[PDB]
Amino acid sequence: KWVIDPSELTFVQEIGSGQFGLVHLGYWLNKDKVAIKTIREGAMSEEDFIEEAEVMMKLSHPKLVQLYGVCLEQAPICLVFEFMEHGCLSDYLRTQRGLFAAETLLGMCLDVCEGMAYLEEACVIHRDLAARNCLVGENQVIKVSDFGMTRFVLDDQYTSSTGTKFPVKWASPEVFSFSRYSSKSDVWSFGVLMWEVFSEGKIPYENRSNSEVVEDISTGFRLYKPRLASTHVYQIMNHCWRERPEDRPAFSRLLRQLAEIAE
Ligand SMILES: CC(C)Oc1ccc2cccc(-n3cc(NC(N)=O)c(C(N)=O)n3)c2c1
Ligand SMILES: CC(C)Oc1ccc2cccc(-n3cc(NC(N)=O)c(C(N)=O)n3)c2c1
């Protein structure tokens, strides 16, 4: 079962304040050390989420952060995850900027691509893949997290393509125009994630408003090549950013292409 009783969790340390509430380091009885995220009432559709728990608990892969269960006896509810010692990838890149070998950056992209190839095979769409949603664990392994969560977020300004907070910087044209999500729209986001990795955590299109990103992308403009990305790596990024989803590679194809580049 995915229901975790309150008596089975102990909070040890406050890790920080997230988007939906607090994050603690804690222990899960007879199981493991965990990250526990407390979710503010009203931030998510909890009833919708728990309906998918029996199916979603079956997903398991070394490059996906495991969400073990939910503590829901009383509000605010808690989501219990595998603990990722080095935190989010975006902050990890920014704090260690100048210390990364190009091979390590390519390895980080390969970990994410492997996790995404598993989700693509499982027919699970991430919808908001970005360096901020990837986590860094033991021996600098990168794992994907928060896949599918935007289907439960209750803030319309974030989830609607016409919303003032829409994450347009990672959105393919069919997502920013029609919310047409697919594993091919996640491939576009993955190309932006590759750019974030090779730029050591720079913000994509930092000098543009949301409408300006939409105009730039629709007129064929793309993110410039980061200094650390080889021309072969940048070519792959551009394949992720093809206007037509049908022309983008599947994650299964990207994984083989990037591994050949690495090895
Ligand atoms: C909550 C964030 C803003 O603050 C921190 C501060 C320090 C951290 C140190 C280590 C790990 C962190 N950490 C741990 C996380 N989750 C899991 N599954 O372990 C996350 C996350 N962003 O989801 N960040 C940390 C997160
Ligand atoms: C207790 C969990 C399995 O319940 C759910 C319920 C609904 C979900 C809907 C979309 C995605 C889910 N989801 C998200 C997960 N992991 C992270 N790191 O976000 C997992 C997992 N199996 O690791 N499942 C869901 C997980």
Coordinates of C-alpha atoms and ligand atoms in Angstrom, one line a residue:
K1 CA 0.0 0.0 0.0
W2 CA 0.9 3.6 -0.7
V3 CA -0.8 5.0 2.4
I4 CA 1.8 5.7 5.1
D5 CA 0.4 6.2 8.7
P6 CA 1.7 9.3 10.6
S7 CA 3.2 6.9 13.3
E8 CA 5.5 5.5 10.5
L9 CA 7.2 8.8 9.9
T10 CA 9.6 10.9 12.0
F11 CA 10.8 14.4 11.0
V12 CA 14.5 14.9 11.9
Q13 CA 15.5 18.1 10.1
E14 CA 14.0 20.9 8.1
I15 CA 15.6 20.8 4.7
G16 CA 13.8 24.0 3.4
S17 CA 10.6 25.7 2.2
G18 CA 9.4 24.4 -1.1
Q19 CA 6.6 25.7 -3.5
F20 CA 3.7 23.8 -1.7
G21 CA 5.1 23.8 1.8
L22 CA 8.0 22.5 4.0
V23 CA 10.5 19.8 3.1
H24 CA 12.0 17.7 5.9
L25 CA 14.6 15.0 6.1
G26 CA 13.1 12.1 8.1
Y27 CA 12.8 8.4 8.6
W28 CA 10.2 6.0 7.4
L29 CA 9.6 3.1 9.9
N30 CA 11.5 -0.2 8.9
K31 CA 12.2 1.3 5.5
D32 CA 14.7 4.1 4.9
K33 CA 15.7 7.8 5.3
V34 CA 13.3 9.9 3.3
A35 CA 12.5 13.5 2.1
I36 CA 9.0 14.4 3.2
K37 CA 7.1 17.2 1.4
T38 CA 4.2 18.8 3.3
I39 CA 1.6 20.1 0.8
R40 CA -0.5 23.2 1.7
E41 CA -4.2 22.6 1.5
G42 CA -5.5 23.9 -1.8
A43 CA -2.2 23.6 -3.7
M44 CA -3.1 20.3 -5.4
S45 CA -6.1 18.1 -6.3
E46 CA -5.4 15.5 -3.6
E47 CA -8.4 13.3 -4.5
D48 CA -7.3 13.2 -8.2
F49 CA -3.8 12.3 -7.2
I50 CA -4.6 9.4 -4.8
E51 CA -6.8 7.8 -7.6
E52 CA -3.6 7.1 -9.6
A53 CA -1.5 5.9 -6.6
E54 CA -2.1 2.1 -7.0
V55 CA -1.0 2.3 -10.7
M56 CA 1.9 4.8 -10.3
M57 CA 3.5 3.0 -7.3
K58 CA 4.5 0.3 -9.8
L59 CA 7.0 2.7 -11.6
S60 CA 10.5 2.0 -10.5
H61 CA 13.8 2.9 -12.2
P62 CA 17.3 3.8 -11.0
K63 CA 17.1 7.2 -12.7
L64 CA 13.6 8.1 -11.3
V65 CA 13.2 9.6 -7.8
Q66 CA 10.8 7.1 -6.0
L67 CA 7.7 8.6 -4.4
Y68 CA 7.0 5.9 -1.7
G69 CA 3.7 6.9 -0.4
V70 CA 1.4 9.5 1.0
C71 CA 0.6 10.4 4.6
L72 CA -3.0 11.7 4.6
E73 CA -4.6 11.1 8.0
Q74 CA -5.1 14.8 8.4
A75 CA -4.2 18.0 6.5
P76 CA -1.7 19.1 5.4
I77 CA -0.8 15.9 3.7
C78 CA 2.8 14.6 3.2
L79 CA 4.4 13.0 0.1
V80 CA 7.3 10.7 1.1
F81 CA 10.2 10.4 -1.4
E82 CA 13.6 8.7 -1.7
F83 CA 16.2 11.2 -0.2
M84 CA 18.4 12.9 -2.8
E85 CA 21.5 14.2 -0.9
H86 CA 22.6 16.9 -3.2
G87 CA 19.3 18.5 -4.0
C88 CA 18.0 20.0 -7.2
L89 CA 20.1 19.8 -10.4
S90 CA 19.6 23.5 -11.2
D91 CA 21.1 24.7 -7.9
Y92 CA 23.8 22.0 -8.0
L93 CA 25.0 23.2 -11.5
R94 CA 25.0 26.9 -10.3
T95 CA 26.9 26.2 -7.1
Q96 CA 29.6 24.0 -8.8
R97 CA 30.0 26.1 -12.0
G98 CA 33.5 25.9 -13.4
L99 CA 34.2 22.5 -11.8
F100 CA 32.4 20.3 -14.3
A101 CA 34.2 18.2 -16.9
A102 CA 32.2 18.1 -20.3
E103 CA 32.0 14.2 -19.8
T104 CA 30.2 14.7 -16.4
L105 CA 27.7 17.1 -18.0
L106 CA 27.0 14.6 -20.8
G107 CA 26.6 11.9 -18.1
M108 CA 24.0 14.0 -16.3
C109 CA 22.1 14.3 -19.6
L110 CA 22.4 10.5 -20.1
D111 CA 20.9 9.8 -16.6
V112 CA 17.9 12.0 -17.3
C113 CA 17.5 10.6 -20.8
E114 CA 17.5 7.0 -19.4
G115 CA 14.8 7.9 -16.8
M116 CA 12.8 9.6 -19.5
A117 CA 13.2 6.6 -21.9
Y118 CA 11.6 4.5 -19.1
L119 CA 8.7 7.0 -18.7
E120 CA 8.2 7.1 -22.4
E121 CA 8.0 3.2 -22.6
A122 CA 5.6 3.4 -19.6
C123 CA 3.5 6.0 -21.5
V124 CA 3.9 8.5 -18.6
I125 CA 4.3 12.1 -19.7
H126 CA 6.3 14.4 -17.5
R127 CA 4.8 17.8 -18.7
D128 CA 7.3 20.0 -17.0
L129 CA 10.8 18.5 -17.3
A130 CA 13.5 21.0 -16.2
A131 CA 16.7 21.0 -14.3
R132 CA 14.7 22.3 -11.2
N133 CA 12.7 19.0 -11.2
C134 CA 15.8 16.7 -11.4
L135 CA 17.6 15.7 -8.3
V136 CA 21.2 14.8 -7.5
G137 CA 22.0 11.8 -5.4
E138 CA 24.8 9.5 -4.3
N139 CA 27.9 9.7 -6.5
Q140 CA 26.3 12.6 -8.5
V141 CA 23.6 10.3 -10.1
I142 CA 20.8 12.4 -11.6
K143 CA 17.2 11.3 -11.2
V144 CA 14.0 12.6 -12.7
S145 CA 11.2 13.7 -10.3
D146 CA 7.7 15.4 -10.3
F147 CA 6.5 13.7 -13.5
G148 CA 2.9 14.3 -14.2
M149 CA 2.4 16.7 -11.2
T150 CA 1.1 19.6 -13.2
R151 CA -2.1 17.6 -13.8
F152 CA -2.9 18.0 -10.1
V153 CA -1.5 21.6 -9.4
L154 CA -4.4 23.9 -8.7
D155 CA -2.8 27.2 -9.8
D156 CA -4.4 28.1 -13.3
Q157 CA -1.8 30.7 -13.9
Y158 CA 0.9 27.9 -14.0
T159 CA -1.0 25.1 -15.7
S160 CA -2.9 27.0 -18.5
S161 CA -0.9 27.8 -21.6
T162 CA -2.5 31.3 -21.4
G163 CA -1.5 31.6 -17.7
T164 CA 0.9 34.4 -16.5
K165 CA 3.2 31.8 -14.8
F166 CA 3.1 29.2 -17.6
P167 CA 6.6 27.5 -17.8
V168 CA 6.9 28.5 -21.5
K169 CA 10.7 28.3 -21.5
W170 CA 10.5 24.4 -21.5
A171 CA 7.4 24.2 -23.6
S172 CA 7.3 22.9 -27.2
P173 CA 5.1 24.9 -29.6
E174 CA 2.2 22.4 -29.5
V175 CA 2.3 22.7 -25.6
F176 CA 2.4 26.5 -25.5
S177 CA -0.3 26.7 -28.2
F178 CA -2.7 23.8 -27.4
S179 CA -1.5 22.0 -24.2
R180 CA -0.9 19.0 -26.6
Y181 CA 1.4 17.0 -24.2
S182 CA 3.2 13.8 -25.4
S183 CA 6.6 12.1 -24.9
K184 CA 7.7 14.3 -27.9
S185 CA 6.8 17.5 -26.0
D186 CA 8.9 16.1 -23.1
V187 CA 11.8 15.6 -25.7
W188 CA 11.6 19.4 -26.5
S189 CA 11.8 20.1 -22.7
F190 CA 14.8 17.6 -22.4
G191 CA 16.6 19.7 -25.1
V192 CA 16.1 22.8 -22.9
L193 CA 17.3 20.7 -19.9
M194 CA 20.5 19.7 -21.9
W195 CA 21.1 23.4 -22.5
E196 CA 20.6 24.1 -18.7
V197 CA 23.2 21.3 -18.0
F198 CA 25.8 22.4 -20.5
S199 CA 25.3 26.1 -19.5
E200 CA 26.0 25.0 -15.9
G201 CA 22.6 26.2 -14.6
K202 CA 21.9 29.4 -16.7
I203 CA 18.2 30.4 -17.1
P204 CA 17.1 29.8 -20.7
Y205 CA 15.8 32.9 -22.5
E206 CA 16.5 35.1 -19.4
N207 CA 16.3 38.2 -21.6
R208 CA 12.8 37.4 -22.8
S209 CA 9.2 37.7 -21.5
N210 CA 6.8 34.7 -22.1
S211 CA 5.2 36.2 -25.2
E212 CA 8.7 37.0 -26.5
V213 CA 9.8 33.3 -26.1
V214 CA 6.6 32.3 -28.0
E215 CA 7.4 34.8 -30.8
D216 CA 11.1 33.8 -31.0
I217 CA 10.5 30.1 -31.1
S218 CA 7.7 30.4 -33.6
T219 CA 10.0 32.5 -35.9
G220 CA 12.7 29.7 -35.7
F221 CA 15.0 31.2 -33.1
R222 CA 16.7 28.8 -30.7
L223 CA 19.0 28.8 -27.6
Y224 CA 22.6 29.5 -28.5
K225 CA 25.3 26.8 -28.2
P226 CA 26.8 26.7 -24.6
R227 CA 30.6 26.8 -24.6
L228 CA 30.8 23.4 -23.0
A229 CA 28.5 21.6 -25.5
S230 CA 30.3 20.1 -28.5
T231 CA 28.8 20.7 -32.0
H232 CA 27.5 17.0 -31.9
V233 CA 25.8 17.7 -28.5
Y234 CA 24.3 20.9 -29.8
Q235 CA 23.1 19.1 -32.9
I236 CA 21.1 16.7 -30.6
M237 CA 19.7 19.7 -28.7
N238 CA 18.4 21.2 -32.0
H239 CA 16.8 17.9 -32.9
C240 CA 14.8 18.1 -29.6
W241 CA 13.6 21.6 -30.7
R242 CA 12.2 20.7 -34.1
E243 CA 8.9 22.5 -34.6
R244 CA 7.0 19.3 -35.6
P245 CA 6.8 16.7 -32.8
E246 CA 6.9 13.9 -35.4
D247 CA 10.4 15.1 -36.5
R248 CA 11.9 15.0 -33.0
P249 CA 13.6 11.8 -31.8
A250 CA 12.0 9.5 -29.3
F251 CA 13.9 9.3 -25.9
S252 CA 14.8 5.6 -26.9
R253 CA 16.6 7.1 -30.0
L254 CA 18.2 10.0 -28.0
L255 CA 19.5 7.5 -25.4
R256 CA 21.3 5.5 -28.1
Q257 CA 22.6 8.7 -29.9
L258 CA 23.9 10.3 -26.7
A259 CA 25.4 7.0 -25.4
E260 CA 27.3 6.6 -28.7
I261 CA 28.6 10.2 -28.3
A262 CA 29.7 9.5 -24.7
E263 CA 31.3 6.0 -25.2
Ligands
LIG1 C1 13.4 22.6 -0.3 C2 14.6 23.2 -1.0 C3 14.3 24.6 -1.5 O1 15.6 23.5 0.0 C4 16.6 22.5 0.1 C5 17.7 22.8 0.8 C6 18.8 21.9 1.0 C7 18.7 20.7 0.5 C8 19.7 19.8 0.7 C9 19.7 18.5 0.2 C10 18.5 18.1 -0.5 C11 17.5 19.0 -0.8 N1 16.4 18.5 -1.5 C12 15.9 17.2 -1.4 C13 14.8 17.1 -2.2 N2 14.0 16.1 -2.5 C14 14.4 14.8 -2.2 N3 13.6 13.8 -2.8 O2 15.4 14.5 -1.5 C15 14.8 18.4 -2.9 C16 13.9 18.8 -3.9 N4 14.2 20.0 -4.5 O3 12.9 18.1 -4.3 N5 15.8 19.2 -2.4 C17 17.5 20.3 -0.3 C18 16.5 21.2 -0.5
LIG2 C1 2.3 7.2 -3.9 C2 2.5 7.6 -5.4 C3 2.9 6.3 -6.1 O1 1.2 8.0 -5.8 C4 1.1 8.7 -7.0 C5 -0.1 9.1 -7.4 C6 -0.3 9.8 -8.6 C7 0.8 10.1 -9.4 C8 0.6 10.8 -10.5 C9 1.7 11.1 -11.4 C10 3.0 10.8 -11.0 C11 3.1 10.0 -9.8 N1 4.5 9.7 -9.4 C12 5.5 10.6 -9.2 C13 6.5 9.8 -8.8 N2 7.9 10.1 -8.4 C14 8.2 11.5 -8.3 N3 9.5 11.6 -7.9 O2 7.5 12.4 -8.5 C15 6.1 8.4 -8.8 C16 6.8 7.3 -8.5 N4 6.1 6.1 -8.7 O3 8.0 7.3 -8.1 N5 4.8 8.4 -9.2 C17 2.1 9.7 -9.0 C18 2.2 9.0 -7.8

